[PDB]
Design a protein around this ligand. Structure first.
Ligand SMILES: Nc1ncnc2c1ncn2[C@@H]1O[C@H](COP(=O)(O)O)[C@@H](O)[C@H]1O
Length: 336
């Protein structure tokens, strides 16, 4: 009944926490995580973690133990998942899209449609960008039979807060089996820069660097209100026959525009150097919805630590088994 999870190996406050919350809500199985971030200088639950826990609590009327800052043990007993309108505030301490990742899978199982609006940080280097959710994950979720639509309403560039991201979701009626493999041909490359409170030549230089390495069929520069920054991100959308993927980098303080763009070029080339449609990050975000569908597969060039973490937690809550068969430097991930 009570699922016991160990945070000692990493992600106790992160991916394990987020996936455990939603799976717990979905299945009705309570869980306890112990040793949350025990080996970190500031150990246990951090502010952003409690926000995620409190959000899940509100959605399903949960009882919780140990939901305090610095706690290395968390116990969560879910109640019934209610649809409806939710507003969460994670502030600069966290990522809007990570709260969304935490709560949305549960809402696929609510009794009615929901809307979730989260205030806090956007454009975080360690979270799915709102546009990634919208343009990469959501078209695939739709294929799986999950219908949700995310819109960023306001930026609050990391490490600030003040951004706003909202998702509309409806309960799943029926799941489908999504099967992905080879990427197929390029249809177009789309380069993008966002700026807030940063000189416009910075975007021009970033686009120029991208163009240096790729033929860009589309190019976009968006200058946002200064108060939403300072901030700068560069993205590249790879639209292929079989999938659309997206890669982004967050501009750093003392890093030249050219270097920032160079980091993104390297990332995209690494993706293109393999045959797989699904990229490194998307892989970890497909595991949960495919496990819930009971079936599905994709290939990925490099199974990440996060992908494996997610697989393990999912298998703890659901009687599914992932196969990961690697040949020729590409791993086929299949929900048995
Ligand atoms: N550049 C990115 N694009 C899309 N998703 C990302 C990116 N970086 C991180 N994520 C996702 O955000 C979550 C947390 O990432 P991490 O903390 O790096 O494990 C995971 O679901 C990642 O796949």
């Amino acid at each position: 009944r009570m699922i016991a999870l160990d945070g000692a190996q990493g992600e106790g406050g992160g991916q394990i926490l987020r996936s455990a919350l939603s799976l717990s809500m979905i299945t009705g199985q309570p869980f306890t995580i112990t040793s949350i971030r025990a080996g970190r200088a500031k150990p246990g639950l951090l502010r952003q973690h409690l926000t995620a826990v409190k959000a899940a609590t509100e959605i399903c009327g949960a009882t919780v133990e140990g939901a305090e800052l610095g706690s290395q043990r968390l116990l969560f007993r879910p109640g019934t998942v209610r649809g409806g309108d939710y507003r969460f505030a994670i502030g600069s301490a966290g990522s809007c899209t990570l709260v969304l990742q935490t709560v949305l899978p549960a809402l696929w199982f609510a009794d009615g449609p929901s809307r979730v609006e989260v205030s806090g940080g956007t454009d975080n280097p360690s979270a799915p960008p709102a546009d990634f959710i919208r343009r990469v994950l959501e078209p695939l979720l739709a294929k799986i039979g999950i219908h949700q639509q995310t819109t960023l309403l306001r930026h609050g560039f990391y490490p600030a807060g003040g951004g706003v991201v909202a998702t509309e979701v409806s309960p799943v009626a029926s799941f489908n089996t999504l099967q992905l493999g080879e990427r197929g041909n390029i249809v177009q490359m789309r380069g993008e820069v966002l700026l807030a409170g940063v000189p416009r030549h910075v975007a021009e230089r970033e686009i120029a660097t991208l163009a240096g390495s790729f033929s860009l069929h589309e190019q976009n520069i968006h200058n946002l209100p200064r108060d939403q920054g300072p901030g700068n991100t560069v993205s590249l959308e790879v639209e292929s026959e079989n999938i659309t993927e997206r890669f982004f980098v967050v501009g750093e303080k003392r890093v030249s525009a050219e270097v920032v763009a160079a980091q993104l070029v390297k990332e995209v080339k690494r993706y293109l150097a393999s045959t797989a449609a699904v990229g490194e990050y998307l892989a970890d975000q497909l595991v949960l919805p495919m496990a819930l569908a009971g079936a599905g597969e994709f290939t990925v060039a490099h199974p990440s630590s996060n992908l494996l973490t997610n697989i393990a937690v999912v298998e703890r809550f659901l009687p599914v088994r992932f196969s990961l068969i690697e040949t020729d430097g590409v791993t086929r991930v299949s929900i048995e």
